[PDB]
Structures are given as structure tokens and as C-alpha cells.
A = this chain, B = another copy of it.
């Protein structure tokens, strides 16, 4: 921080004594169930070597966790979102550049416990018959415990360039009725992948043996709301002061099936079965300081 290097807090920040122009653009993709919103801000700070545009991609991508197929009361399929993505990209010829973005990837951590225990113990015995016993034993033990926190979905910044940047919010693992957690590769010889399995031996229809969406991550059904920031810089001398930028909102769905094996339910999961993409092109005008679609 500025204070760490003996400089007045905020001394190096951009934006002071500058008139900032903001805007809001909303688009609803019915087919893809995506409410997409861009909130932008043009900052042309004259004490800065470039014009700046901050693009905040928000809105909400519905989850759409849903039983889609059902062939027999012993077989059914469930579609669920294994990944949500937001990506922005400047066409090859553009002179403006991706300069910054937030959030970024943070370094995870874990706590580790190492334990060593020494012990001795004696023991004198007897009986109503006069006999007397004796016991002397020792003991040692080495314990190791690992502790780490894990979110239902991980928010990752995709390797950016000066032309593109993106974020993917991917399913990590999830608790199923106080068990697991489970993930896309969880496997049990008897039950297979129990990720979204309600009962193991329940005797009901297949379509009726999936975890209640309310008892699972809310992003799976109701959805995830992007809140990412992208900073584009533009030279004041660039010959062309109009820039196009394409934005993609995407949902990748997995296929989780449950079938009855005469004795119990067994679950299977196939990755990236379906991909839903919604694309929009925005026109950036650095002279009028407006963004449109």
C-alpha cells in the first residue's frame, strides 16, 4: 500500500479532477436464460497517459438444474451447470488494450498438524485367591491432520492477453445431506457417483430420486451473478477512436443420470454434455465517451 512506501494514501490513483461518464446496458437472452448487464465508466484523466474504460460485467446466468429425460421409473437424467463463464475480447485489429481486471487468482492455503505422543503405564492386579499380577507397557503414536476450506465453486481468472480476458466459475465439490463432499469424479463401486442422489435404495421413480435443488448449491438452480471488472486503455492519438468488443456469457452443463440396479440406485456423470453461449458486440466510442449495443 502507498503507506508502506511512505507515500500519501491515494496519491497515485487515477480519476481526480475528472468528469466520469457512466452507462448501463441490459440484454436478456430468453433462449439461454441469461440476464446480462454491462456497467461502464469512461475515465479520461489528463494527468494519465491514456484514456480508460472500466467495463463491469454483471447480471445473472440462470443455473437450470433440471430433470430432462425419463425412460422408465428406473432411469432418469438430470442437467446441471458445471461451469459459468464471462469473456470479453477485442478484435485482432483493435489498438485499445486489456490493461487490468479484477478479481484475479488468489493463492490457496491449508493448515497442517503434526502430533507426537509418548506414554507409559503400569498395573498391579490380584484376586480372592491370593494371586498377584503385574503389567508395564509403553506407547508411541504419530498423528497428522490436514485442514483446508473448499468452496462449492471456484472463481478463476482465465489467462488474459492484451486482447482478451475471462473468468470461469467452476463446480468444485458439494456436500450432499451431510456427506461427501462429492465432485464430478466421485465413484463408489456400489452407488457410483452419489453427487445428486437423494436416496440410495429408495423405492420411487428415478425422476424423483434427485437431490432437492434447495438442499444443493443455489448456483445450480437459481444461478450465478457475475461481478467482474475489466479495464481497457486507449491512446489519445490512436487514429481510430471506435472500438468493438465482444462479450460471451456461457453455461456449461453436465449430465447426471440415475438408474436402478435391481438392488439399489447408481449414479453416473458425463462432463460438458451441453454448452449454452450468448454473445453480444458492444461499440465503444472514445470521443463521445459512450458504449452501445
List residues of chain A with CB under 8 Å of any chain B CB: 1-16, 18-28, 30, 33, 35, 37, 39, 41, 43, 45, 47-50, 52, 54, 56, 58-60, 62-64, 97-163, 169-170, 172, 175, 178-181, 183, 185, 212, 214-215, 217-219, 221-225, 227, 229, 231, 233, 290
Contacts and interface: CB of A to CB of B under 8 A. Distances in A.
Contacts of A142: 117-119
A278 B90 CA distance: 23
**Within the oligomer, what is the number of copies of this chain?**
6
Contact of A107 (B47, B125, B153): B153
Contact of A124 (B50, B137, B163): B137
Given A102-B5, A128-B130, A139-B122, A112 B49 contact: no
Nearest to A30: B161
A127 B137 contact: no
20 contacts: A1-B102, A5-B100, A7-B231, A12-B43, A24-B49, A28-B163, A33-B159, A35-B162, A104-B225, A109-B149, A112-B149, A115-B143, A115-B144, A121-B137, A125-B134, A125-B135, A126-B135, A127-B133, A172-B214, A183-B215
A39 B4 CA distance: 12
A137 B154 contact: no
Nearest to A173: B110
Given A60-B104, A117-B142, 12 more contacts: A11-B16, A24-B48, A24-B233, A28-B163, A107-B169, A109-B152, A112-B148, A117-B141, A121-B139, A126-B133, A157-B218, A159-B221
